[PDB]
């Protein structure tokens, strides 16, 4: 009645892995058991970049409990569409290339479509710093020991790309919300007015927004995490992924922590407050439209700021 | 600069304010205000439009000008004498066609929207909404042309505009059906309506009768314990919040034709489980939970 | 069903599941009244003797049940009292939370208990506890709100002195931050650069940190940071063997990459500086190689070299 | 100080390095080494015994003194002349009741442990193992008394003294059974033992019969395994412990924790844990220490 895989640790079956894909069990297990468990970029970034297949490894989506991509390359014979990631079979596919391993750079130099991540500089090519944080075997974190911050490069049809200037979502939760800057600390520490005062924000309608819904169309309000975090000395909130998939704007079930009383299904975006202030101040208030399109996580998000 | 009074010695400049502008130039905007029938602000907002060309668009709901930077309207607020030229082509300019010159300036400017009441050589139109704002009065013209054809450019490129539903713009106070369906819905009880339009075993239930609310459903509930809405925060939003009380919620309401909303309701699976729906309404992508 | 729900939108969302002897409605209430502010972890509480909470409910999120058998003035159907000073309590170590008013007071009157406070208390000397607390069952150290308490104990009338203790950090291996300069360079140096930098030759450090210093406990008994370094290249999935929290914790150890077995066995997570202090403390010229250490207020016995 | 030689002398002192002591004084230790039959080091270690009074306990596997800290033995190494002084305040000191005077010094001592060949005024004995260590050879005394009665003091307070199993202290080569049960376990096939000593549907299976994969094993279990297809093992490190590691070869099996329990004792352990067949965390007392381990 099962598709679970086990190991014996003493006279005890512990379930090492459950199969939640359509693939036959042991085929899936192979796939898993070849996950890159070193630092990878996060699913949101790779979706946003339009990446469909990784070179020579497997990116596992730990929330979805399945591999992040349809096929493979030089990994698992029963789903490999190729062996070297330059075979005719995948010229028309944005291929993740991990520059930390040898010879992947030139594989990418010779690829038609792809993105290359690396720990450092690359000869003749302009980087763009990515997030501070990466994904170490499920857990996303910013790390002291291992380096988690990469530089991205993109190719669309023979040609290197200019990657948009972006902000990055901070991949934080409410359970453990840690301030990442002075402004952020202050905001949580101080009282609204004393804050607006200190950072010079009179007549921006700050209080209105941080706490308010700035959705241009996303499902339920668009609230900002650090803003949800401040409304938590009073009765605080539990979150819960509405859909397993990771993305920049994220749908949740918000319910009271203390008692479960339902609230909404609404979207949160976790941004550095500094980056948030910068965008509220970017808005020109003299024009008709109050939609602000900002590019965050290499993707375009539309806001309603007023 | 500002006009002033001399209230015994001396100059006491007089400011609007509501826009902070000198009454002086504030009023010069009211003057040059567009008086021919214009697109409702919500659709301008959605299409992300910045300034109109050689005019002001008035915000009668805010009782202020929709925009305080101008093109060829008032020297104290003009960012440029003419739309198609220099530090100006980055922002999205609304070009109106039923004034001549303008049409030709759209094909020369970078970012911009264009409305017209007929077709234009070589371009594909997208039918706008029936209604338009007429000096603060939103209405469906039969004496005058209020329905436009829209066209948009970004970075130089003509865009294909999405297939859309448009919101109806009805106030509740004087609500009035616009189809056999909307009629029947208000007449028929719940159960009979679900069986006439073969809707049984779909989602809609809560959203229609009683998160997000449908204006038309809110009107049927008005014949039951008459309710009133007042917007704490008055702009013009495709989805608007209202303070809701009786004749003795803070609600998202959307005004949609049932004939359109039931097209939506049916383009799902036979549920009855709650569904995420992503429609284009008023040129903008709306996500909401249907049940 | 055991399951309690709210309709979020039109969707059944489980907010609570019963895994208790009690009926749903009663357990749910207890859950629903559980203190969700910062609290001492259960290891510290059991180590101390606490068997009941004043006016609150300590919840075990790993065991998904109350931390304690009865209540005081929380829930009419599991209350043994209403006030913590009633004679039905005078034989039980009661947790008194100083951060709320007058609880300090009931603690003076109480004949058996433990009082935590976020600052000094007139007449009594404090035991500066761990840096970390549990906050709605996510154990963390807070810079935002406070997580570090002071402890006091009473045993049948009499004020107590708490032994001086080391405290287990509380760090899963899946996310392991070093908390001192010693831990940083340990992880980021070679063993031999290390032993020298900190002048540790003539202790058989490499033998200890990396090995098994157990006197009895089931499986090996390994330092966490120890495991984290060997983890560096060949990493390990670590998984609770028993829901109950404790100072020395048994685990199912398993390869991360593939699930190959390894063992059941205990880990203890200590600050390296503390560990190094404990090895340096052992007197090498005696028959017994058993070092007893008080950690998290309990006696923990080791085996050294 | 150290003795020395003269090579183009210049005095050249002489050391070890087993202890680091002057050969000189390391030998005084050898000289004063207790040669009456003393309890096995493991039991001393577990009772947390620090040093012995007016004697030296020798560790033959380490080929050295179990302790370098002395009392009343040697000027260079001791910490007190007499076990009662305030230097032995905080140290568990072994006292013997075979040398008189000491039997009484235990009464006016803080922390310490005492052994005797018979009972003592109004103290409850805990009957120790059958075996002592008689000069590097441990055995069960035929004509000499090797069983002890133990008593312990922590902080002037006479202590609890638990009930214990004891390990049998048997090397594998020279292996001899010590009951009908151990006898049959060697004789009877894998399946026959189970029906005879009615223990079908208990845990016990693996740890008694043998693996590739590695947890605890018991001595006799390994003996039956080499009772054909012989197996060789030896101290990886030369300690003395209730549970010791071995290199099994065999060509290797390889690093096992091994425990030498008399079967009947271990069997009464299996039987104290309701019919299951599921793995079982046992927490038992062996050699006066709480050892916990997984039974399957």
UniProtKB/Swiss-Prot annotation, chain C:
Domain AV-Nsp11N/CoV-Nsp15M: 35-160
Domain NendoU: 177-305
Active-site residues from the entry: 207, 222, 262
Catalytically driven reaction(s): uridylyl-uridylyl-ribonucleotide-RNA = a 3'-end uridylyl-2',3'-cyclophospho-uridine-RNA + a 5'-end dephospho-ribonucleoside-RNA
Cofactor(s), names only, from the UniProt record: Mn(2+)
Top-level division of the source organism's lineage: Viruses
Cofactor notes: Likely affects Nsp15 binding to RNA.
Protein location: Host cytoplasm, Host perinuclear region
Record's function text: Plays a role in viral transcription/replication and prevents the simultaneous activation of host cell dsRNA sensors, such as MDA5/IFIH1, OAS, and PKR. Acts by degrading the 5'-polyuridines generated during replication of the poly(A) region of viral genomic and subgenomic RNAs. Catalyzes a two-step reaction in which a 2'3'-cyclic phosphate (2'3'-cP) is first generated by 2'-O transesterification, which is then hydrolyzed to a 3'-phosphate (3'-P). If not degraded, poly(U) RNA would hybridize with poly(A) RNA tails and activate host dsRNA sensors.
Subunit organization: Homohexamer.
Protein name: Uridylate-specific endoribonuclease nsp15
Natural source organism: Severe acute respiratory syndrome coronavirus
Organism lineage: Viruses, Riboviria, Orthornavirae, Pisuviricota, Pisoniviricetes
Gene: rep
Interval of the full protein contained in this chain: 6457 to 6761 of 7073
